[PDB]
Scaffold this active site. Sequence first.
Site, PDB file in Angstrom:
ATOM      1  N   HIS B  41       0.814  -1.228   0.000  1.00 27.15           N
ATOM      2  CA  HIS B  41       0.000   0.000   0.000  1.00 27.15           C
ATOM      3  C   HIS B  41       0.852   1.285   0.000  1.00 27.15           C
ATOM      4  O   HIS B  41       0.294   2.375   0.104  1.00 27.15           O
ATOM      5  CB  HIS B  41      -1.094   0.040   1.096  1.00 27.15           C
ATOM      6  CG  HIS B  41      -0.582   0.204   2.492  1.00 27.15           C
ATOM      7  ND1 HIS B  41      -0.434  -0.881   3.331  1.00 27.15           N
ATOM      8  CD2 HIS B  41      -0.230   1.322   3.161  1.00 27.15           C
ATOM      9  CE1 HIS B  41       0.019  -0.397   4.472  1.00 27.15           C
ATOM     10  NE2 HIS B  41       0.155   0.924   4.421  1.00 27.15           N
ATOM     11  N   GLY B 143       2.580   6.106   9.497  1.00 31.62           N
ATOM     12  CA  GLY B 143       3.991   6.056   9.139  1.00 31.62           C
ATOM     13  C   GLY B 143       4.727   4.874   9.749  1.00 31.62           C
ATOM     14  O   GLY B 143       5.907   4.675   9.454  1.00 31.62           O
ATOM     15  N   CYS B 145       3.814   1.644   9.252  1.00 31.93           N
ATOM     16  CA  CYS B 145       3.718   0.512   8.327  1.00 31.93           C
ATOM     17  C   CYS B 145       5.083   0.106   7.788  1.00 31.93           C
ATOM     18  O   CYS B 145       5.931   0.960   7.554  1.00 31.93           O
ATOM     19  CB  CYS B 145       2.724   0.797   7.209  1.00 31.93           C
ATOM     20  SG  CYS B 145       1.077   1.255   7.794  1.00 31.93           S
TER      21      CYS B 145
HETATM   22  O1  LIG Z   1      -4.181   1.876   9.230  1.00 31.53           O
HETATM   23  C1  LIG Z   1      -3.256   2.019   8.436  1.00 31.53           C
HETATM   24  C2  LIG Z   1      -2.078   2.922   8.738  1.00 31.53           C
HETATM   25  C3  LIG Z   1      -1.695   2.930  10.199  1.00 31.53           C
HETATM   26  C4  LIG Z   1      -1.163   1.803  10.805  1.00 31.53           C
HETATM   27  N1  LIG Z   1      -1.121   1.625  12.130  1.00 31.53           N
HETATM   28  C5  LIG Z   1      -1.637   2.616  12.857  1.00 31.53           C
HETATM   29  N2  LIG Z   1      -2.195   3.739  12.403  1.00 31.53           N
HETATM   30  C6  LIG Z   1      -2.217   3.870  11.072  1.00 31.53           C
HETATM   31  N3  LIG Z   1      -3.186   1.399   7.238  1.00 31.53           N
HETATM   32  C7  LIG Z   1      -4.225   0.786   6.500  1.00 31.53           C
HETATM   33  C8  LIG Z   1      -3.880   0.164   5.306  1.00 31.53           C
HETATM   34  C9  LIG Z   1      -4.856  -0.463   4.547  1.00 31.53           C
HETATM   35  C10 LIG Z   1      -6.181  -0.451   4.953  1.00 31.53           C
HETATM   36  C11 LIG Z   1      -6.522   0.194   6.130  1.00 31.53           C
HETATM   37  O2  LIG Z   1      -7.846   0.241   6.508  1.00 31.53           O
HETATM   38  C12 LIG Z   1      -8.353  -1.044   6.952  1.00 31.53           C
HETATM   39  C13 LIG Z   1      -9.830  -1.154   6.545  1.00 31.53           C
HETATM   40  C14 LIG Z   1     -10.078  -1.383   8.028  1.00 31.53           C
HETATM   41  O3  LIG Z   1     -10.996  -1.838   8.703  1.00 31.53           O
HETATM   42  N4  LIG Z   1      -8.841  -0.969   8.357  1.00 31.53           N
HETATM   43  C15 LIG Z   1      -5.555   0.807   6.914  1.00 31.53           C
END
Ligand SMILES: O=C(Cc1cncnc1)Nc1cccc(O[C@@H]2CC(=O)N2)c1
EC number: 3.4.19.12
Lengths: 304, 304
Positions: B41, B143, B145
Site C-alpha cells: 500500500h 507512518g 507501516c
Molecule cells: O491503518 C493504516 C495505517 C496505520 C497503521 N497503524 C496505525 N495507524 C495507522 N493502514 C491501513 C492500510 C490499509 C487499509 C486500512 O484500513 C483497513 C480497513 C479497516 O478496517 N482498516 C488501513
Amino acid sequence: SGFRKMAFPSGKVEGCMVQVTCGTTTLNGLWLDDVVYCPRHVICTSEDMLNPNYEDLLIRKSNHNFLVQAGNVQLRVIGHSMQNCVLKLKVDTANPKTPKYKFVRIQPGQTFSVLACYNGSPSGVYQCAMRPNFTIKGSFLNGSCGSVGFNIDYDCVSFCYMHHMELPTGVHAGTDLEGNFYGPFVDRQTAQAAGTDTTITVNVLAWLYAAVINGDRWFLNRFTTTLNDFNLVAMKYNYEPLTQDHVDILGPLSAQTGIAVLDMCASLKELLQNGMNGRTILGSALLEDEFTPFDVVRQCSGVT
Amino acid sequence: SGFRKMAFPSGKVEGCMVQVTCGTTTLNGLWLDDVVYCPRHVICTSEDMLNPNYEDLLIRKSNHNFLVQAGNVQLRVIGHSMQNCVLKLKVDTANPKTPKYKFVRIQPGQTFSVLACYNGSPSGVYQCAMRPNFTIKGSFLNGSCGSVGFNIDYDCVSFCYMHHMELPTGVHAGTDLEGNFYGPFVDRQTAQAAGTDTTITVNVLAWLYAAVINGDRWFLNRFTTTLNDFNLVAMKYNYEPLTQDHVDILGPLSAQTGIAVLDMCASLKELLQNGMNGRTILGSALLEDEFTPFDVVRQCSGVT
Ligand SMILES: O=C(Cc1cncnc1)Nc1cccc(O[C@@H]2CC(=O)N2)c1
Ligand SMILES: O=C(Cc1cncnc1)Nc1cccc(O[C@@H]2CC(=O)N2)c1
C-alpha cells in the site's frame, strides 16, 4: 493507536556490552571509549560479599587479573581504578561502536530501558522506572550484574543505571555510571530492605491521558478536585504527593485531550476510592505508573 | 528474580530498517541482502485505499518512483515485484548489516518483538503476541507501516510479521515476510472487524509457572482437574482449549517447579471462577497471556 510498554531500540547499547571476568566471577561491563565500566563486586568471591573491604581486595588485583572480552576478542587492560561502586578498566582500544553518550543520574519516577546481559551478551530489553524507594523491579538472574539502564535522545545515549544487586525481596538495586547507588543500598550481602513502594502519581495521570487519547474513556467522570483534596486521597493510597510542577509537566497532555489536570485527578480519585470494578484501562487491570508524561508524548507522536 | 515483558535486543533489526517513499506516501522497509521489503500500500493515495487494484496501480510505477533511503544515503532501485501484499524492491547494494535470517510464519499464541519505526528510523521496541483472532495489539501510528516483528535464535533473526493496517477497533493487522496476511484481513480501507479475542491458555499457565518460580504462590491451591474438566471452564471464559500438546510443552516448567500441569490448571480454574480478589500475580491484576512456555524458560535461564 495502541499503547505498549515500549523500550528504546537497544542496538547502540548492545555495541557497548562486554564480559568482565575477575577470578571466578564473570559479569557484564560497558565499554565506552577506552574505558570499561562494571560493578566493583567483580573482584569478590561469594564469601567476600558478606563483609567486603573493596580497597583491601583491590590491592591484590593487577591489570592482568581483569579479563575483558568483547564478542570473542580479548581487550588489553592498561589501567584500573575504583570510582565509588564501579571499576573503570582502561583498555588499549577505544570502542569503535561508542555512541554519543552522557552519564546522568535520574530521579525516582523517571523511566529507562534496561538491556539485560549475561557474559557480555544482551539477551533482552525492557522498560523500567526508578521506584520512589530507589529500587527497580527488573528481571535479572545471576551474571546479569553490569547490565545497564539508558535513555536515548535522538542519537545520544544517557546511561543512568548499572545493575549491582538483588535484595531478599526480589527487587533490584544498582548505581549511576559514576558508581553511586540509587537509594541507601550498599554492595554488601547484608540485611537490606526497601522502603515503601509508593505509586508515581504523575505517571499514572500521564497514562490516564494516554488512555483517553487511545479511546478508553469510561473512567472520565463529571467531577473535579484540588491539589490539596487529591493529595489527601493520594497519601491514603500510598501515592506520591502531586505538585504544581507535575501539573505543569502534564500541560501538553491536558492541552491535547482538552481534559484539565485537576479533572483527571478527580477521575483518578474515584478510581482509587472505587477500584476498576472488573474493567480495564489500556488492557491493564491496575493503575500503571511506569510511563512518564514525556513517554506518553513520545509514544503518541513517534519520537524516533 | 523478577519477570518482565522482555523484547529481544533490537540492534540486528535496526541495521535493516530503511525509509520507502512512493509519491506522497512514506513508510518503513526491511533491507535484507539486495532486496527491500515493504507493504504494497506504499503505492496508494489515501483515496486508492478504499478500493485498490494493486496490479493496475503497480503498472504506473517504475523502479525510479520508489525512493529508498537507509539512514541518509539513497539506494538505487534496479527492480520491483509484488509478492502477495508486500513489494520487493531489488536494490544495487546488499545491506552490509544483513544478519543471518529466516522468514517464518508464526501461529497464533506465539510471541515476537516489534521494532516500531517511522521514516525508516526505529523509535521503540516491545513484545507482542499473535492473538488467536490474528490481530496484534501493537502501538503504531501513521507512518509505522513496514515495522517488523521478529524472534532471535542466538544470532539468526526469524522475521515473522510486517505491520500493514490498523482496524477501526484500534487493533493491528499485518503479514508474514512473504506478504500473506495473518487472518482474514485485506489491505483495503473497508469494514474489517476482528473475531473474538480469546486468551492463550498455555501462555497463562506458563506465566503462572513463572510466578511460582519468582515467589508469588498465593494462588496455588489443594486441587487438581482433568483436561476435559478444565476445558469446560476455559470455554466458558473465552480461553483457548488446552491440548495434550500444550501439556507436553509445559513439561519443563512442570518439572522445574514440581507442580504438575493439571494441578496448575486447577489453580487457573479457581482464578477464573473467583477472580484475583484485589491481589496481583507478578505485579499484574489480570491473567497475562503474552509469554509462551519457551519465553518463560528463556527468561528464567538467561538465553542470550
Ligand atoms: O491503518 C493504516 C495505517 C496505520 C497503521 N497503524 C496505525 N495507524 C495507522 N493502514 C491501513 C492500510 C490499509 C487499509 C486500512 O484500513 C483497513 C480497513 C479497516 O478496517 N482498516 C488501513
Ligand atoms: O544479587 C546479586 C547478584 C544478582 C543480581 N540480580 C539478580 N540475581 C542475582 N548481587 C549482590 C551483590 C552485592 C550484595 C548482594 O546482597 C545484597 C545484601 C542484600 O540484601 N542483597 C547481592
